Every structure is written in C-alpha cells, then in structure tokens.
Amino acid sequence: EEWYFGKITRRESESLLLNPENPRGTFLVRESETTKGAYCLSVSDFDNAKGLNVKHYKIRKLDSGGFYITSRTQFSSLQQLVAYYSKHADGLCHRLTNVCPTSKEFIVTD
Amino acid sequence: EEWYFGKITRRESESLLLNPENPRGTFLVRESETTKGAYCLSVSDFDNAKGLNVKHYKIRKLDSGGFYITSRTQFSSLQQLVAYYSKHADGLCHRLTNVCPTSKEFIVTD
C-alpha cells in the first residue's frame, strides 16, 4: 500500500508525522531500524494538554504466518494489521486515518 | 512439573531419551542452550525402519502471555503446552507420554 515507508529512521518519521496538516491517526509503517526483522507502526496523536505528538509501536514477526502488536490480536499480513486498526482502535492511541506525506513541507487539499 | 529439565545440552537429553525402557512419547522440556529465552520439547520416537530416535522442537516465547511450537496452536503456559500435547498429538511425532528418567541407567517398573 502507500503506507509503507521502508527504512527511514525514528527521526525521519517523527518529522514527517509532525506536520500541522496531519489529522489525528495519520500513519506510517517502517522497518525496525537496527533491531531487525520487525516493524514499527508510527501514529500521529493529539491532546490539548501536550499537543502534537507521535507514538511508536512495534510490529512483531511471529516467525511464520503472522504479525502482531498485542498477543491478543493477531494478523496474517501487514495489510490485515493496517485494515483492522483503520476500523477499530483496539487500545491504540487512535484509529488509523491518513497515510503520511513525503514531505517538504506538504499542505493538504480539500 | 517433573518434566522440566533446565539446562542440559541436546546431547545430554538425547542420551537420556535413548533409553531402551522409554515408551514412545517420552519427553523432556529443556532451556534453549545458546539461543536463549526459548525452550525445546524433546520427544522419543520409534519407527521399525529407523529405530529409536529423538526429535527436538522449539518452544517459542511470544514475549508475552504465551508460548507455542506452531503459530496455529498457542498456550498461556508451559504446563498448558504439555497438557495439550499429552492429549492430542496435533502434528507432533507422538502424544506425550512418560516423563524422562534422570538417568544411570534407569529401568522402568510395572
């Protein structure tokens, strides 16, 4: 899908996700820079107290037919992960919403 | 349970499990010598063609509430693993049966 950002560092993802223009729930999926085989979901969040923030999530490889963040909720594929959390937040910070821009420094249409 | 053999090497388990006196399905659970955090189920097997043999199985740690050999069949605990495969073989070589002796060189009663 568009959402797969390959191997940028935590930084380079934080700078993308910290764009004023991103809706809450904007995301990217990245490879696990220097701890590898795994992934990371990166989601922009917002609260009124602390403002724009972004949280990181490890996507574990079940060495198999499988990926998960929590043991309680498991997927066949990364597209199944993303399509689930797009519909239900299930204990993430927020539902998935936009895919992240690329960037420099991107303004969103209507 | 009795079945937990801590950290003997593959060898030291193969020599225990290769006792003529062991029923098919005799087992031990061991820690994963030099690849660690994981375990190994070790089961004595028999066929008429190849004779007494023993097969090894990795017990994966789900870094969590969980252990499994196959992704399709998962457990809360090591006692739940062992109690399942004691009842159903579910694609192992054999149902679990005896716990392994300790040894030197042990003969089984009736």
Enter the tokens of residue A40: 């990371």
- 3-state secondary structure at position A25: coil
Query: In chain B, how many domains are there?
Result: 1
Retrieve residue A92's tokens.
Answer: 């993430």
Q: B72: which residues sit within 8 A by CB, 6+ positions away?
A: none
Residue from A35, A59, A61, A64 whose CB has the most chain B CBs within 10 Å, to mutate: A64
CB-CB contact of B85 with B16 (8 Å):
no
Residue whose pair of structure tokens reads 């003969």 in the numeric block? B107
Domain boundaries, position A26: 1-110
Method: X-ray
Asked if residue B58 lies in contact with residue B69, where contact means CB atoms within 8 angstroms, the answer is yes
Please count the helices (runs of H) and the strands (runs of E) in chain A.
2, 5
Direct distance between the N- and C-terminal alpha carbons of chain A, in angstroms, rounded to an integer: 22
Listed by number, the residues of chain B in 65-84 with a beta carbon closer than 8 Å to a beta carbon of chain A are 65-66, 71
Give me B103's structure tokens. Answer: 């040894």
Which residues in A lie closer than 8 A to residue B71 (C-beta atoms)? 62, 64-66
- What number of other Cβ atoms are within 10 A of residue B45's Cβ? 17
How many angstroms is the resolution? Answer: 2.1
Would you say the C-alpha torsion B6, B10, B12, B17 has a positive or negative sign? Answer: positive
Query: Is A68 within 8 Å of A75 (Cβ atoms)?
Result: yes
Find residues 13-72 of chain B whose CB sits inside 8 Å of chain A: 60, 62-66, 71
Residues of B in contact with A65 (CB under 8 A): 71
**Angle formed at CA A62 by CA A56 and CA A66, multiple of 5 degrees:** 90
| Residue A44's CATH number | 3.30.505.10
